[PDB]
Amino acid sequence: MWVRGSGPSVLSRLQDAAVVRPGFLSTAEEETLSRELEPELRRRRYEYDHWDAAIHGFRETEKSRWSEASRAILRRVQAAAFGPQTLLSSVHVLDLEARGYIKPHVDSIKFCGATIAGLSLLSPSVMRLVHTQEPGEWLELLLEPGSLYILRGSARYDFSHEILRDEESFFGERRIPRGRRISVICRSLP
Ligand SMILES: O=C(O)CNC(=O)C(=O)O
Ligand SMILES: [Mn+2]
């Protein structure tokens, strides 16, 4: 329903490594972030395209000074995704344009620890993970507004991950029209 896989083996080994909690956020939680982030996002334009960047058609910011309503929500993520694993000083807020997308990559093992957790806002999209070593081993995730994903262990380190572009935005056989989508991403320290 939300996770698809190249085979039964990838699905089993990555069962608590790459996970999807759709409807992690209520409507009211969704609007709290949406509303809080819009001014600081509108305050910048969709930054320049440099062919070899991972992210295209995006603007972004790092936020650490949050409302009490928004802090409550990140703590929920923190609670649900991280253990004893310290957080980064701040949260990465990524605003993709409908025409924007994210190419396959692994997050900097230098700066990002062993867990990545993203909240998804506004519009649906699919994140694809492919084994770096083995192209045949992949998982696609359906990320809906209000969803939380967690990428940890081997899905963080031996798999690349990407958010598909509108012309490729498929979950199995089903087109998932791409719109503007904000991500709120929480990362662990090395
Ligand atoms: O949460 C997201 O939008 C996906 N995150 C990443 O792939 C990234 O920041 O490079
Ligand atoms: Mn990434």
UniProtKB/Swiss-Prot annotation:
Gene3D superfamilies from the UniProt entry: Alpha-ketoglutarate-dependent dioxygenase AlkB-like
CC cofactor note: Binds 1 Fe(2+) ion per subunit.
Consequence of changing residue 94 to Q: Does not affect ability to trigger programmed necrosis
GO CC annotations on file: mitochondrial matrix; mitochondrion
Binding site residues for 2-oxoglutarate: 149, 181-183, 187
EC number of the protein: 1.14.11.-
Keyword Cell membrane: no
InterPro entries: AlkB-like (IPR027450), AlkB-like_sf (IPR037151), ALKBH7-like (IPR032870)
Annotated localization: Mitochondrion matrix
Tissue: Widely expressed, with highest expression in pancreas, followed by spleen, prostate, ovary and placenta.
Binding positions (Fe cation): 105, 107, 161
Family: Belongs to the alkB family.
Quaternary structure and partners: Monomer.
Function, in words: May function as protein hydroxylase; can catalyze auto-hydroxylation at Leu-94 (in vitro), but this activity may be due to the absence of the true substrate. Required to induce programmed necrosis in response to DNA damage caused by cytotoxic alkylating agents. Acts by triggering the collapse of mitochondrial membrane potential and loss of mitochondrial function that leads to energy depletion and cell death. ALKBH7-mediated necrosis is probably required to prevent the accumulation of cells with DNA damage. Does not display DNA demethylase activity. Involved in fatty acid metabolism.
Official protein name in the record: Alpha-ketoglutarate-dependent dioxygenase alkB homolog 7, mitochondrial
Annotated source species: Homo sapiens
